[model samples]
Target: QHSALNARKQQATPRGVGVMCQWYAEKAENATIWDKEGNQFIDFAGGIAVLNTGHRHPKVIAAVTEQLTKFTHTAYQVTPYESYVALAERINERAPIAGPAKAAFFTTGAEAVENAVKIARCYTGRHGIITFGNGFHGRSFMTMAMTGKTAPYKRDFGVMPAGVFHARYPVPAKGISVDAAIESVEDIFSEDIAPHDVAAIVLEPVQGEGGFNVVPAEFLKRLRAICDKHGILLVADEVQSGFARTGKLFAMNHYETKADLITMAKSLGGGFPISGVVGRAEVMDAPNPGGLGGTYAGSPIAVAAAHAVIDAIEEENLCDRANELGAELVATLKDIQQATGDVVTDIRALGSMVAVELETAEQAKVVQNYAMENGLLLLTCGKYGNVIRFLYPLTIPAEQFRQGLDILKQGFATLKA
Candidate 1:
């Protein structure tokens, strides 16, 4: 069954949209996905960290089910709904941004990121934007340009948008320093765009595709200070790090400094299609009516799911749950590292966002392939593709989580064998 469908998928779908598992999903529960042949696999990928509330959470499905009875879409620009405004209000209340905050909805992470850039440019009257190396924004034209890494994300794409710059994201594991990161920005000011002409400085608080490198606290503070000094807005690309996955509602919550605009997606809608930018009211108001909306930007269905996601996060104390799960994952990774000796290069985590780096991409792939064959789904990421990131749903059952960890430990042990 899997072999036959793999051929059909290859013929029907473009190669650009890659599929990690060729088995094809038959069905999925909270943290388990069943293949076409009914093989149960623990889903540690979490749909690229989009299932923090887990696949088909009761509240999320119930919320969407109720919304299905009502009108789904009229396009916010055509006919606004109270639920949209209400969802925005709820996000405004919860987001790490200071009060007097406002949020605008979009359908994808790229839209939220690009729209954040638009808002920054409109407010600051500047066109220059700065991002960091190893940052992953999205796949849209503007976002693809804003993204830092090249190879796969921008291999065929040509003539990326101008006025965007790249700085070095601090990674001590790779010997990058906070001072060096800041100087890279200053270098941009001297060599590229002027400080005053720069609109925004964007980065991922905990980089997702860049191997879950948590932005150093000191570096973030320094960046905040520089943005304040230079009249540039700070945009945190929390697309993969937000929605209570990082032991907080937003990764910025872990730091003393905050960003001017926060781009959030992945888990915001409880497995539904929705993204948003929450920022200070003044900055958010930069765009006039119709300046920042999409036809399906704030669909009633997605908005309802967003509401449920927020409620689920709060009522279930998912923020605390994330820390608990993360601690255990970290412990397990450390044990595996010890058993595997020098093969495990690094182990890092910020709440439930955890990753283990092997000495080489090939070694990581060994573990990844082994885990898959053993009914565990894992995702590898990084500049070198040597990082194994654990994005298990926060709502995964304790026993199931243990089972997945056991498989992961054994997979790493395979390296020694």
Candidate 2:
């Protein structure tokens, strides 16, 4: 079944957009995906950290279907909807902002990031933007340049937009510390642009696609201070770590310091596609009316889904569940590390955002292959693709969660031999 589809796919699509799976999906429910051939896989990839509430949650589907009966899209710009403003109000109350907050919705995480930068540039009247090495923003032109990875995302793009720079992100395993991370920014200021000339410094609270590397608390504190000193805005890209994926409504909630702007996408709509940027009122107002928003921005269906999503996160108490699930996963990974001690270099986690570093990409591949053969979907990330990140839905049933973990542990044990 897959071979025929694969051949057809090869003919139909370009290789530029790389796909991970061989089998095509028939239907997915919660943490399980059924391929076209009826083979089932316990989904740990979660669509590259998108489905925190799992696939087609009943409430989310209900909300969407109900909206379908009402209307599909009116282009909020054409006829403004109250649901859009209500969602922004909900976002404002919940976002970790120091002052009165505001929000604008978009269709994708990259669009959220792009607009965040637009707002920052407008507010500060500066063009310089700094992002971290190994940070993964969206693949839009501006975000392509903002993303630190060069090989695949930026390769052959023929020079990205100007005013974006990459700074070192702290990785204890690689000996990159808070001091080194800060020094890199200082170095950029000294060599590339002055402090006041910089518009914003954007970062993922937990660097998704960068192996779930969490930002050091001290570095965040100092960075906030530095931004204030220089009149620069701090932007937290929670595209992958937002919602309940990081054990908090937003990853920035884990810290004492708050970011001036936060970009959210992945799990915000639960399953329907939506993204948004929440920020301080004054700063968000910098962009004039009509400057923000897209034709499909804040679709009523997605906005309704977002409302239900926020309800699920609150009523279901997934934030606390994320903490519980992540802790147990880390414990399991640590035990497995003792078996695959030579190959697994490190295990790290923040809430359910978990990952393990292998000795090399080859070893990671071995683990990946073992899992795929055994019917568990796993995803590998990091600059070198040497880290295996677990992104199972926070709403995954306990029995299924335990089963998936066992599969992972067993997969790693194959390398012990």
Candidate 3:
């Protein structure tokens, strides 16, 4: 069954849509997935960090179903709905902005990021944008321009948007320092664009695709000061790190300073497609009326699911669960590293957003393949693709989480042997 489907997919879909595993999923429940061949695998990818509440969460399903019975799409721009406004209000109230905040919904993480940039530019009347090295934003023209890696994401995409600059992000494991990171920003202002001309400086509190490198707290404070000094908006690209994934409602909560704009998606809607830009109310309302919104900006069904997602997170205590799960996973990985020296270079996590970096991309691929063959699904990320990132659902059953960890340990042991 898997072979036939693979053959058909190869013939029908473009090569750009890459598939990591050969088997097609038949169904998923919580942290486990069953393939068309009836093989069960413990899922650590969590649909690319989009299912923090787990697959087919009861509350999310019920909310979406209730919305479906009423209506699916009214094109919120054409005819607004109560759920849309309600979800925005909920997010605004919980957003990590300093004072009053506002929110606007979109369909994808990229759209939220793009709209965040638009809001910043409109608010500050500046054309220059700043990003950091080894950062991953999105795949759109503007976002691709903001992203730092170039091999696969930016390859063959000609003429990216101009006035976007990239600076170094400090990675202690790689010998980069927070001071150097601050100096890089100064250099960008001096060499590339004036600090006053930059509308916003965007960064991920924990870079997802660029390896889960957590930005230093001191660096965040310094960046906030710089933004304030230059009258620039500080944008936190929380598309992959928000919604209790990092033991906080937003990753920015880990720092003392606040971001001017926050872009979120991925797990915001449970399993539905929804993204948002939440920011200072004044900055969010800078654009003229009719400048924001889309045809399907905030679908009723997605909005309903998002509201339920927030509720589920609060009710389930998923933030505390994230920290608990992270502590155990990190301890297990450390034991594995001790048992098999030099195989695992580094292990890092904030809450349940964990990753283990191997020495080489080939080694990472070998370990990932071994895990997949042994009834576990894992994902490889980082600029060099040598980092195995764990995006397991915070709601994963204890037994299943332990099983996944055992498979990961076995993969490392096999590789070491």
lDDT of 2 by residue, 1-417 (tens): 599889999999998989988889999998999987789999998888788888888888888998999888999888988899999999999999988999999999999999999999999999999999888898888999999999898897787888899999988668998999999999999998899889999999899998889998999999999999999999999999999888999999999999999999978887778999999999999988878879888979999899988988898999999999999999998888776667878888889999999989998998898889888999999988999999998899999999888888888888767
Q: Quick one: best lDDT, which candidate?
A: 1
Off by over 4 Å in 2: none
Count of clashing residue pairs in every prediction: 0, 0, 0
Which consecutive 10 residues in model 2 have the weakest lDDT in total? 337-346
Task: Tell me the tens digit of each residue's lDDT in model 3 across 1-417.
Answer: 478888899899999987778888899988889987789999899899999999988999999988888999988878888888888899988888888989999999999999999999999999999999889889999999999999888987899998999999989778889889999999999999998899999999999989999999989999999999999999999999999999988988888889999999989988889999999999999999889888777878889998999999999999999999999999999998898866789988999888999888988888899998899999999988999998999999998899999988888888768
Error of 3 at 18 (Å): 1.2
lDDT of each: 0.92, 0.91, 0.91
Whole-model alpha-carbon lDDT for candidate 2:
0.91
Runs of candidate 1 exceeding 4 Å displacement: none
Every model's TM-score: 0.99, 0.99, 0.99
Task: For candidate 2, report its TM-score.
Answer: 0.99
Predictions: Cα RMSD each: 0.9, 0.9, 0.9
Q: Relative to the unseen true structure, what is the C-alpha lDDT of residue 408 in candidate 3, on a scale of 0 to 100?
A: 89
TM-score of 1: 0.99
